């Protein structure tokens, strides 16, 4: 029932999470519970990972259409 509804959601969330990460003080950083304290090497790999996830979510949306 509409394979676009989940894909559209993941495109927005990943695009937002990709944007929100440029703010070092956004609440989107609070989700990495299993880290005792975010060092700056964590942030570098998180930015990279979140840009990849957006590309995947981008492509998945275009495919559902």
């Amino acid at each position: 029932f509409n394979r676009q509804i989940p894909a559209a959601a993941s495109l927005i969330q990943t695009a937002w999470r990709c944007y929100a990460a440029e703010n070092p003080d956004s609440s989107t950083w609070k989700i990495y519970i299993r880290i005792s304290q975010l060092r700056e090497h964590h942030r570098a790999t998180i930015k990279v990972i979140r840009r990849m996830q957006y590309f995947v979510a981008k492509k998945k949306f275009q495919q559902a259409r």
């Binding site: 509804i5 559209a8 937002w16 999470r17 989700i31 990495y32 790999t45 995947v56």
Partner: protein
Amino acid sequence: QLTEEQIAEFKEAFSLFDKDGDGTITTKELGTVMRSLGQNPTEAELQDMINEVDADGNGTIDFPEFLTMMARKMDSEEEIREAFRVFDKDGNGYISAAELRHVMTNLGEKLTDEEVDEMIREADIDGDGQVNYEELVQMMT
């Protein structure tokens, strides 16, 4: 503009992924990083992430492919806009904060309430809970 301070930062960012030092990011190394951050990804997720960046199809990511991937900007704004439309029931260009939070926190990647708050706090214009999502498309681009 093709920055140079950025290439350094990206060099350092590539290294955290390429533990080897062989100049290549494989899915194993990418899941090693993700798992260290508290994420349990599936190889379908890892392979999709590599496929999006692996521009020559050899199944791994070398540094120039990394560069391309970081060097991109966001028009992807019409895809995002269309993504929002899927949830604009009234077709008005608006989504209610209650509905936004409901679909954001319960579908897809599942944002947290504070994360959604930042969205709502960013694009309300009128403080009556009507989220102007064209403002979001605009903020992220």
